[PDB]
Amino acid sequence: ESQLDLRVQELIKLICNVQAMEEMMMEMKYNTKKAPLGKLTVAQIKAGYQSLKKIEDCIRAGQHGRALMEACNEFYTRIPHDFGLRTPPLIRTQKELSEKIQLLEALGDIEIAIKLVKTELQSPEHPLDQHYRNLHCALRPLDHESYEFKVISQYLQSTHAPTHSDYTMTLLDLFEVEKDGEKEAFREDLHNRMLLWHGSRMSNWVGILSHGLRIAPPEAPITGYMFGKGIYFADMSSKSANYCFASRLKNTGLLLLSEVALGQCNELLEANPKAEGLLQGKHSTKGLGKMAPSSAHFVTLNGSTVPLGPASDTGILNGYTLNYNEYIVYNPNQVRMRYLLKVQFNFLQLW
Ligand SMILES: NC(=O)c1cc(F)cc2c1C(=O)N(C1CCN(C3CCC(F)(F)CC3)CC1)C2
């Protein structure tokens, strides 16, 4: 029997679910059974990015005819997909491109996550405890009546955007996070330390809790990244929550809060995929949203600023304008994961 707190057992059982990783890949037309992750080569994955680059080139230039169809055939050649019967579809928009780009990263990530959940040959220990141990990340459940849970719930509820009205969120449980090595590596020296959201797909959490949040790999096409290749956070809960991709069938998602050492922000009104180059001494990029929590409402939690809402207009306006801030850092050493929220999404049927 498991020696873990019951709340941790449920958390672990949820994120370590292998089926759920298979099903997420299958949704992106990758069959892990027909094509085991273990057989992908480094060079195969590199060739796949190479073809996604040719696809991106076509798309950015509005070329949807023959050059695009060949680039897509070359992509499907290099990366095995499973379409059931149908004609492999053309990769035509930014959303479909970007799904492919994320797919490629998840192939290596899911492969390592599935190795992580392997229990030892001999061991009497409950598998939950082995899974938990293998993450190398302490997850400490907090009581609902505690001050910290109340503050986090306010931050969750107060910063749910008024324009994300398709669901509410309930906080089911809150875990304080202590990832091995992160405290020692953290840029404790940098000013402007903020506690910020990061939402992600259920199958990504094994990789995040065992590796921390990572920048995208060198070979991925840069021009999909609106502010460069770093780690992205929101100060609005529902904006990160949108990246959980919860659904009615699986209405449970996770949100991560991290202390992020922002230092001096390079504040940018408009997207720039070359944003990291623009730093010249600064430490992060802030993409300037129209709406935002105001510093008058801010509290602190362990010396990070917690930007409580509600959001209000910031007088930023433009071309394109960001709805809400987002923050980017370019080294994991500016991040220290701190709370993980287990969240019930309640979807609404509105018209
Ligand atoms: N995950 C978050 O909580 C989050 C919060 C924010 F405020 C903003 C962002 C995220 C988040 O994950 N972001 C990702 C979403 C996906 N993009 C890229 C889109 C282009 C690509 F090529 F496919 C790579 C992925 C990179 C940024 C933005």
mmCIF file of N, CA, C and O in Angstrom, residues 5-15 139 141-142 144 149 152-153 156-157 169-177 197-198 202 205 244 246 251-257 339-346:
data_model
loop_
_atom_site.group_PDB
_atom_site.id
_atom_site.type_symbol
_atom_site.label_atom_id
_atom_site.label_comp_id
_atom_site.label_asym_id
_atom_site.label_seq_id
_atom_site.Cartn_x
_atom_site.Cartn_y
_atom_site.Cartn_z
ATOM 1 N N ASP A 5 0.359 10.685 0.843
ATOM 2 C CA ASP A 5 -0.938 11.337 1.084
ATOM 3 C C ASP A 5 -1.921 11.032 -0.062
ATOM 4 O O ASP A 5 -1.536 10.961 -1.254
ATOM 5 N N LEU A 6 -3.199 10.924 0.256
ATOM 6 C CA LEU A 6 -4.164 10.474 -0.733
ATOM 7 C C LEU A 6 -4.322 11.454 -1.885
ATOM 8 O O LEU A 6 -4.668 11.054 -2.989
ATOM 9 N N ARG A 7 -4.163 12.745 -1.586
ATOM 10 C CA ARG A 7 -4.326 13.775 -2.564
ATOM 11 C C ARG A 7 -3.180 13.654 -3.608
ATOM 12 O O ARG A 7 -3.389 13.835 -4.821
ATOM 13 N N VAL A 8 -1.968 13.380 -3.136
ATOM 14 C CA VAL A 8 -0.806 13.114 -4.031
ATOM 15 C C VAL A 8 -1.014 11.826 -4.899
ATOM 16 O O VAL A 8 -0.685 11.801 -6.107
ATOM 17 N N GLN A 9 -1.590 10.776 -4.297
ATOM 18 C CA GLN A 9 -1.860 9.537 -5.028
ATOM 19 C C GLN A 9 -2.755 9.807 -6.207
ATOM 20 O O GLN A 9 -2.522 9.282 -7.276
ATOM 21 N N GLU A 10 -3.822 10.571 -6.008
ATOM 22 C CA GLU A 10 -4.677 10.925 -7.130
ATOM 23 C C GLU A 10 -3.976 11.789 -8.157
ATOM 24 O O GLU A 10 -4.175 11.644 -9.361
ATOM 25 N N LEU A 11 -3.129 12.695 -7.699
ATOM 26 C CA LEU A 11 -2.452 13.540 -8.648
ATOM 27 C C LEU A 11 -1.532 12.680 -9.548
ATOM 28 O O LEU A 11 -1.612 12.768 -10.770
ATOM 29 N N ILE A 12 -0.686 11.862 -8.919
ATOM 30 C CA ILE A 12 0.248 10.952 -9.580
ATOM 31 C C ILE A 12 -0.481 9.993 -10.532
ATOM 32 O O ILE A 12 -0.074 9.799 -11.674
ATOM 33 N N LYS A 13 -1.576 9.388 -10.088
ATOM 34 C CA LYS A 13 -2.300 8.424 -10.942
ATOM 35 C C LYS A 13 -2.824 9.093 -12.219
ATOM 36 O O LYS A 13 -2.765 8.535 -13.324
ATOM 37 N N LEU A 14 -3.276 10.319 -12.067
ATOM 38 C CA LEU A 14 -3.724 11.127 -13.186
ATOM 39 C C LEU A 14 -2.633 11.460 -14.192
ATOM 40 O O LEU A 14 -2.803 11.201 -15.381
ATOM 41 N N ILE A 15 -1.492 11.981 -13.754
ATOM 42 C CA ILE A 15 -0.498 12.432 -14.756
ATOM 43 C C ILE A 15 0.353 11.303 -15.310
ATOM 44 O O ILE A 15 0.883 11.414 -16.401
ATOM 45 N N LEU A 139 5.722 17.166 -3.832
ATOM 46 C CA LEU A 139 4.393 17.717 -4.057
ATOM 47 C C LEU A 139 3.608 17.654 -2.771
ATOM 48 O O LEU A 139 3.093 16.599 -2.393
ATOM 49 N N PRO A 141 0.577 18.546 -0.448
ATOM 50 C CA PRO A 141 -0.808 19.076 -0.510
ATOM 51 C C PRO A 141 -1.077 20.107 0.608
ATOM 52 O O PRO A 141 -0.587 19.926 1.720
ATOM 53 N N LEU A 142 -1.794 21.199 0.298
ATOM 54 C CA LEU A 142 -2.189 22.215 1.319
ATOM 55 C C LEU A 142 -3.676 22.054 1.638
ATOM 56 O O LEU A 142 -4.430 21.624 0.757
ATOM 57 N N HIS A 144 -7.535 23.263 2.313
ATOM 58 C CA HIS A 144 -8.420 24.246 1.732
ATOM 59 C C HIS A 144 -8.651 25.398 2.658
ATOM 60 O O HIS A 144 -8.938 26.507 2.203
ATOM 61 N N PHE A 149 -4.022 28.591 0.344
ATOM 62 C CA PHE A 149 -5.049 28.096 -0.575
ATOM 63 C C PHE A 149 -6.067 29.182 -0.905
ATOM 64 O O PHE A 149 -6.431 29.337 -2.088
ATOM 65 N N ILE A 152 -4.270 31.695 -3.294
ATOM 66 C CA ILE A 152 -4.178 31.110 -4.638
ATOM 67 C C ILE A 152 -5.527 31.040 -5.328
ATOM 68 O O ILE A 152 -5.585 31.331 -6.485
ATOM 69 N N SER A 153 -6.584 30.668 -4.609
ATOM 70 C CA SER A 153 -7.957 30.692 -5.149
ATOM 71 C C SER A 153 -8.430 32.034 -5.594
ATOM 72 O O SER A 153 -9.084 32.126 -6.604
ATOM 73 N N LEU A 156 -6.487 32.664 -8.797
ATOM 74 C CA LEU A 156 -7.186 31.892 -9.832
ATOM 75 C C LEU A 156 -8.514 32.607 -10.230
ATOM 76 O O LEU A 156 -8.774 32.811 -11.414
ATOM 77 N N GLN A 157 -9.349 32.952 -9.258
ATOM 78 C CA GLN A 157 -10.698 33.458 -9.643
ATOM 79 C C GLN A 157 -10.612 34.907 -10.139
ATOM 80 O O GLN A 157 -11.099 35.212 -11.192
ATOM 81 N N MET A 169 -13.820 27.718 -13.201
ATOM 82 C CA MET A 169 -12.810 26.753 -12.751
ATOM 83 C C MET A 169 -13.007 26.557 -11.281
ATOM 84 O O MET A 169 -13.295 27.511 -10.588
ATOM 85 N N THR A 170 -12.911 25.319 -10.809
ATOM 86 C CA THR A 170 -12.872 25.062 -9.379
ATOM 87 C C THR A 170 -11.479 24.488 -9.017
ATOM 88 O O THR A 170 -10.907 23.618 -9.741
ATOM 89 N N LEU A 171 -10.937 24.990 -7.903
ATOM 90 C CA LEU A 171 -9.714 24.468 -7.349
ATOM 91 C C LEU A 171 -10.014 23.191 -6.545
ATOM 92 O O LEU A 171 -10.648 23.230 -5.497
ATOM 93 N N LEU A 172 -9.596 22.044 -7.058
ATOM 94 C CA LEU A 172 -9.837 20.780 -6.331
ATOM 95 C C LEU A 172 -8.758 20.569 -5.255
ATOM 96 O O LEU A 172 -9.088 20.209 -4.168
ATOM 97 N N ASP A 173 -7.485 20.825 -5.572
ATOM 98 C CA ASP A 173 -6.373 20.641 -4.620
ATOM 99 C C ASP A 173 -5.190 21.494 -5.072
ATOM 100 O O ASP A 173 -5.125 21.878 -6.206
ATOM 101 N N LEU A 174 -4.277 21.773 -4.158
ATOM 102 C CA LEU A 174 -3.188 22.700 -4.373
ATOM 103 C C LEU A 174 -1.985 22.031 -3.753
ATOM 104 O O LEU A 174 -2.077 21.583 -2.613
ATOM 105 N N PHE A 175 -0.892 21.937 -4.484
ATOM 106 C CA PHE A 175 0.311 21.248 -3.982
ATOM 107 C C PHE A 175 1.427 22.268 -4.022
ATOM 108 O O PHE A 175 1.523 23.012 -4.995
ATOM 109 N N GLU A 176 2.258 22.329 -2.998
ATOM 110 C CA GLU A 176 3.401 23.221 -3.047
ATOM 111 C C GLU A 176 4.468 22.360 -3.724
ATOM 112 O O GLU A 176 4.500 21.183 -3.484
ATOM 113 N N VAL A 177 5.314 22.926 -4.578
ATOM 114 C CA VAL A 177 6.187 22.144 -5.424
ATOM 115 C C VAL A 177 7.604 22.458 -4.990
ATOM 116 O O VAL A 177 7.921 23.612 -4.757
ATOM 117 N N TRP A 197 1.386 32.128 -14.033
ATOM 118 C CA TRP A 197 0.798 30.921 -14.529
ATOM 119 C C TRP A 197 1.460 30.269 -15.701
ATOM 120 O O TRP A 197 2.103 30.928 -16.516
ATOM 121 N N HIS A 198 1.249 28.956 -15.823
ATOM 122 C CA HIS A 198 1.710 28.155 -16.989
ATOM 123 C C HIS A 198 0.785 26.987 -17.057
ATOM 124 O O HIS A 198 0.649 26.244 -16.063
ATOM 125 N N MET A 202 -2.501 17.642 -20.138
ATOM 126 C CA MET A 202 -2.325 16.653 -19.070
ATOM 127 C C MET A 202 -1.071 15.738 -19.213
ATOM 128 O O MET A 202 -0.452 15.412 -18.212
ATOM 129 N N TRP A 205 2.774 16.794 -18.001
ATOM 130 C CA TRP A 205 3.187 17.123 -16.645
ATOM 131 C C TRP A 205 4.261 16.235 -16.091
ATOM 132 O O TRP A 205 5.082 16.691 -15.299
ATOM 133 N N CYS A 244 -4.423 24.116 -21.204
ATOM 134 C CA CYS A 244 -4.632 22.822 -20.599
ATOM 135 C C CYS A 244 -5.366 21.927 -21.568
ATOM 136 O O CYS A 244 -5.287 20.687 -21.466
ATOM 137 N N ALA A 246 -8.423 21.248 -21.545
ATOM 138 C CA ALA A 246 -9.452 20.396 -20.937
ATOM 139 C C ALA A 246 -10.698 20.434 -21.820
ATOM 140 O O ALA A 246 -10.756 21.189 -22.774
ATOM 141 N N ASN A 251 -12.714 16.992 -17.711
ATOM 142 C CA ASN A 251 -12.810 18.352 -17.231
ATOM 143 C C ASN A 251 -11.797 18.671 -16.114
ATOM 144 O O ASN A 251 -11.860 19.743 -15.499
ATOM 145 N N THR A 252 -10.860 17.758 -15.854
ATOM 146 C CA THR A 252 -9.796 18.041 -14.897
ATOM 147 C C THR A 252 -8.520 18.397 -15.604
ATOM 148 O O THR A 252 -8.078 17.633 -16.444
ATOM 149 N N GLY A 253 -7.958 19.579 -15.275
ATOM 150 C CA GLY A 253 -6.639 20.051 -15.781
ATOM 151 C C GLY A 253 -5.683 20.552 -14.689
ATOM 152 O O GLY A 253 -6.111 20.821 -13.554
ATOM 153 N N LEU A 254 -4.403 20.713 -15.005
ATOM 154 C CA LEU A 254 -3.480 21.264 -14.003
ATOM 155 C C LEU A 254 -2.985 22.673 -14.402
ATOM 156 O O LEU A 254 -2.645 22.914 -15.576
ATOM 157 N N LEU A 255 -2.849 23.550 -13.413
ATOM 158 C CA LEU A 255 -2.115 24.820 -13.606
ATOM 159 C C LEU A 255 -0.856 24.909 -12.742
ATOM 160 O O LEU A 255 -0.903 24.670 -11.578
ATOM 161 N N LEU A 256 0.227 25.303 -13.295
ATOM 162 C CA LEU A 256 1.415 25.546 -12.520
ATOM 163 C C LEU A 256 1.664 27.019 -12.190
ATOM 164 O O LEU A 256 1.643 27.891 -13.111
ATOM 165 N N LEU A 257 1.964 27.305 -10.928
ATOM 166 C CA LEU A 257 2.475 28.674 -10.577
ATOM 167 C C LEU A 257 3.942 28.602 -10.270
ATOM 168 O O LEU A 257 4.369 27.760 -9.487
ATOM 169 N N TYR A 339 3.642 26.134 -6.982
ATOM 170 C CA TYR A 339 2.331 25.505 -6.693
ATOM 171 C C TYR A 339 1.841 24.791 -7.934
ATOM 172 O O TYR A 339 2.025 25.270 -9.061
ATOM 173 N N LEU A 340 1.160 23.696 -7.724
ATOM 174 C CA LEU A 340 0.487 23.036 -8.852
ATOM 175 C C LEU A 340 -0.918 22.931 -8.368
ATOM 176 O O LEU A 340 -1.144 22.501 -7.232
ATOM 177 N N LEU A 341 -1.836 23.371 -9.217
ATOM 178 C CA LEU A 341 -3.260 23.424 -8.936
ATOM 179 C C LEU A 341 -3.916 22.368 -9.777
ATOM 180 O O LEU A 341 -3.622 22.286 -10.953
ATOM 181 N N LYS A 342 -4.757 21.554 -9.133
ATOM 182 C CA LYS A 342 -5.588 20.542 -9.771
ATOM 183 C C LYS A 342 -6.929 21.208 -9.895
ATOM 184 O O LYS A 342 -7.518 21.626 -8.886
ATOM 185 N N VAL A 343 -7.418 21.341 -11.129
ATOM 186 C CA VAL A 343 -8.519 22.267 -11.409
ATOM 187 C C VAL A 343 -9.637 21.557 -12.148
ATOM 188 O O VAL A 343 -9.404 20.965 -13.204
ATOM 189 N N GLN A 344 -10.861 21.668 -11.638
ATOM 190 C CA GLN A 344 -12.052 21.173 -12.346
ATOM 191 C C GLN A 344 -12.612 22.289 -13.240
ATOM 192 O O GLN A 344 -13.040 23.319 -12.742
ATOM 193 N N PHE A 345 -12.545 22.093 -14.556
ATOM 194 C CA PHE A 345 -13.181 22.985 -15.520
ATOM 195 C C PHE A 345 -14.677 22.676 -15.630
ATOM 196 O O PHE A 345 -15.057 21.521 -15.883
ATOM 197 N N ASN A 346 -15.519 23.688 -15.427
ATOM 198 C CA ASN A 346 -16.960 23.531 -15.607
ATOM 199 C C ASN A 346 -17.367 24.260 -16.868
ATOM 200 O O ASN A 346 -17.381 25.489 -16.891
#
